[PDB]
Amino acid sequence: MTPKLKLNNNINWTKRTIDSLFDLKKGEMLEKELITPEGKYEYFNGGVKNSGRTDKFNTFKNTISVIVGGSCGYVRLADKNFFCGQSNCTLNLLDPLELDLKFAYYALKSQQERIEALAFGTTIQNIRISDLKELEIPFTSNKNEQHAIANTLSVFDERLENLASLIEINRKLRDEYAHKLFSLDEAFLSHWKLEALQSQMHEITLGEIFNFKSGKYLKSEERLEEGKFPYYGAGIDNTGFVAEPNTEKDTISIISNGYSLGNIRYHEIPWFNGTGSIALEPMNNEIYVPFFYCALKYLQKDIKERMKSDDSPFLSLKLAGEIKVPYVKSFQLQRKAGKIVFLLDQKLDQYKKELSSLTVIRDTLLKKLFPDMT
Ligand SMILES: [Cl-]
Ligand SMILES: [Cl-]
């Protein structure tokens, strides 16, 4: 009973049954006519996600639950009032003074695989309540240590929650801005001082403002897994790294092959253009590349959909050169328009990177902070 990450010295860790720490109650049957997509509360039954919404609740926020039918073993700490269903079980603290709520949640959460293992069946899975009660979890009666561990794993959880909320806010605003931009919404052009676009914006083909190169190809013996300069080749993200980049920063690429065909990205750093990839290099300095990136992202679904009804093939340099995008000649005006959308893209990109990074860190710390019982 020694955690791999120790916050304090000489902590006495012990095993405790769920029965010795919690009061267990299964949820209730929610009648179908009480389920409405516009309902105030979540219906948490057998899923990790809700099984619907309602205007009824039977469980206050800040109650721990464990799924005992369906996605068995899953541990939740609800931050909103909710409707607990029959495949879900609440675990109420027997003594709040011996045991911190948030610590209790993490102690249970760290043993999630061992709770899952209690289930019978695979396709239809159930946990018996009497088995759940008998499961031992790691415990310490040191309150300072309970708070230290709960504090460490809350800051992660609260940031992830806030990040998810930020991504969703900024995804919708970004979509709105792009749509109002490229359709030239009058009220939007007024507010953002882009009235000049009304007269000046027209269609150009990509081949008139960019030059194209298809991706080059490197053997596994010519790649690194950690490097400075990313290799890009047919997945949306880098397949490893490179010694010498072959393409400059401030460039666009489009995947030409496979299932990620027609996906567009902007390059902030020098990179390697690999086999299922096309690079776009602006023909002169008067091109604000991120304007065009935004324009292509706006059209990305349309391009994919067109490539589908093409042959089911690849995107050639010929076809890519033919892509029509909105265009204004003025550099200052490309930047002024483009920046409104593109600053949200960059914000969203950092948020998604941080969310992905902290998810991994949070999983790592949760495992290391509690004694291993397998
Ligand atoms: Cl089954
Ligand atoms: Cl798409």
Swiss-Prot record:
Q: Which residues form a coiled coil?
A: 143-182, 331-370
Concerning CDD domains, the annotation shows: RMtype1_S_MgeORF438P-TRD-CR_like
Domain of life, per the record?
Bacteria
Q: Name one GO molecular function term.
A: DNA binding
Q: What is this protein called?
A: Putative type I specificity subunit S.MgeORF438P
Ranges for the region named TRD1 are 1-142
Tell me the function of this protein.
The specificity (S) subunit of a type I restriction enzyme; this subunit dictates DNA sequence specificity. This bacterium does not encode the associated endonuclease or methylase subunits.
Question: Looking at the record, which segments are called TRD2?
Answer: 183-330
Q: Which family does it belong to?
A: Belongs to the type-I restriction system S methylase family.
Question: What is recorded about the protein's domains?
Answer: Contains two target DNA recognition domains (TRD), each specifying recognition of one of the two defined components of the target sequence. The TDRs show high structural similarity and each forms a globular structure. The two TDRs are separated by 2 long, conserved antiparallel helices that form a coiled coil structure.
Q: Where is this region: Conserved region 1?
A: 143-182
Give the disruption phenotype, in one or two sentences.
Answer: Not essential, it can be deleted.
* Region called Conserved region 2, residue ranges: 331-370
